[PDB]
Amino acid sequence: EVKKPAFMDEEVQRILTKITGLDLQKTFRPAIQPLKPPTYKLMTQAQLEEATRLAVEAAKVRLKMPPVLEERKPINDVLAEDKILEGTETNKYVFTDISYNIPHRERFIVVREPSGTLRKASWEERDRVIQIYFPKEGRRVLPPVIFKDENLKTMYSQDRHADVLNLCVAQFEPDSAEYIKVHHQTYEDIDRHGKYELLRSTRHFGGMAWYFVNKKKIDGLLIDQIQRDLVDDATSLVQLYHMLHPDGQSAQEAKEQAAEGVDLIKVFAKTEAQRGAYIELALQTYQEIVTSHS
Amino acid sequence: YEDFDTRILEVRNVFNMTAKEGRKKSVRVLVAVGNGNGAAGFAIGKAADRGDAFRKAKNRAIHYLHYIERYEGHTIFHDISLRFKRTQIRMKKQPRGYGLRCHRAIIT
């Protein structure tokens, strides 16, 4: 069986990196943090171009995309059931192995319940106690209150989607249900309100486009990329949609006609586009403007 | 000059001994002026009455307006160390939000 493309596949990361884009002014926007007096260097045009190159290298590491994973499976394993200890304790004990050189996903965290059952700690208990003994800057022991739907809607009104996601990466694990819930809620609000530009030149654009491709709703991102004159990006999105859905009618139509470039986007409109009529209209208007002006 | 403000930096009661009046007193006032937009100046006015020394110094300083270069409108372009006679000043360029942390006269 032809392997389903992965998020980290070298080909997918190429397309996702391209459509994401780069902008040194957005990637290195000034942080509202304690400040120090700036430094100054006299540089020639050769030196200045070298410094811009190093800035672009750092902007690549800054834009490294966070993992897209499947939801972890509940831990329900009973190590022992010592019924002699039933009724001798009122509260659960949580035992955590805190040997420094163990990966956190390979640590043993067990719970001795009042009934006497010795069981493995659930995912919620594992993440909470690892924050208590291996604290990570940015994460809190108890789930913050900003992730509630009412509070999240507040952040969306202020166009603070990149922060909602930057907060979701500091607090939750990539495979947790809370992580997936918050990300999928941010991506969905961007879609309905067409705020795709907020996550461009950010590490969160790849996951957003990935989510739309898998959910077969790239129509909005194509209409938005076309209207911004980013039609090379739109073509790459249709290639990624023809890569993760090879047996789709659209992918089979492009093979029949050996479509390339703008042809790929026209094929998508007729075959699998939820709103094909608009994709052609925006694509047609772009061609008219490009042809008419130049 | 409604856009200019005047501040007093020193008021002194000096004395000149005279045969007719003995110890005679005058008011020597040092003022500085500025429009808060880069232009500032200072002058000394002397008179026998304080109100007159204020008028003399205030209108004299407007004739000696320096223009001071501010980096981005909020700070000096670079550190400045100098000795004027026996007074030493060491200024430092600082980031936004640092505020004025200087002699009270320098703050004025």
UniProtKB/Swiss-Prot annotation, chain A:
Cellular location(s): Mitochondrion
Q: Does the keyword Ribonucleoprotein apply?
A: yes
Q: What happens when the gene is disrupted?
A: Heterozygous MRPS22 knockout mice are fertile and show no overt abnormalities. Homozygous MRPS22 knockout results in embryonic lethality.
GO function terms (MF aspect): structural constituent of ribosome
Gene Ontology annotations for the cellular component aspect, listed alphabetically:
mitochondrial inner membrane; mitochondrial small ribosomal subunit; mitochondrion
Highest taxon of source:
Eukaryota
For whether the record's keyword set contains Metal-binding, the answer is: no
Please give the biological process terms from Gene Ontology that the record holds.
mitochondrial translation
Indicate where this protein is primarily found.
mitochondrion
The chain residues annotated with the modification N6-acetyllysine are K148
Task: List keywords of the entry alphabetically.
Answer: Acetylation, Mitochondrion, Phosphoprotein, Ribonucleoprotein, Ribosomal protein
Query: What does the subunit comment say?
Result: Component of the mitochondrial ribosome small subunit (28S) which comprises a 12S rRNA and about 30 distinct proteins.
Family of the protein in this entry: Belongs to the mitochondrion-specific ribosomal protein mS22 family.
Q: What is this protein called?
A: Small ribosomal subunit protein mS22
Organism equals Mus musculus (Mouse)
Swiss-Prot record, chain B:
Membrane-spanning segments: none
Q: Where is the signal peptide?
A: none
**Alphabetized GO MF terms:** RNA binding; structural constituent of ribosome
Does the record carry Mitochondrion as a key word? yes
Q: What GO biological process, any one, is recorded here?
A: mitochondrial translation
Superkingdom is: Eukaryota
Entry coiled-coil feature ranges: none
Which positions fall inside the S5 DRBM domain?
A: 4-68
- Keyword annotations from UniProtKB, A to Z: Mitochondrion, Ribonucleoprotein, Ribosomal protein
Q: Which GO terms describe its cellular component?
A: mitochondrial inner membrane; mitochondrial small ribosomal subunit; mitochondrion
Write out the annotated subcellular location.
Answer: Mitochondrion
Subunit info here reads: Component of the mitochondrial ribosome small subunit (28S) which comprises a 12S rRNA and about 30 distinct proteins.
| Family in the record | Belongs to the universal ribosomal protein uS5 family.
Protein known as:
Small ribosomal subunit protein uS5m
What gene makes this protein? Mrps5
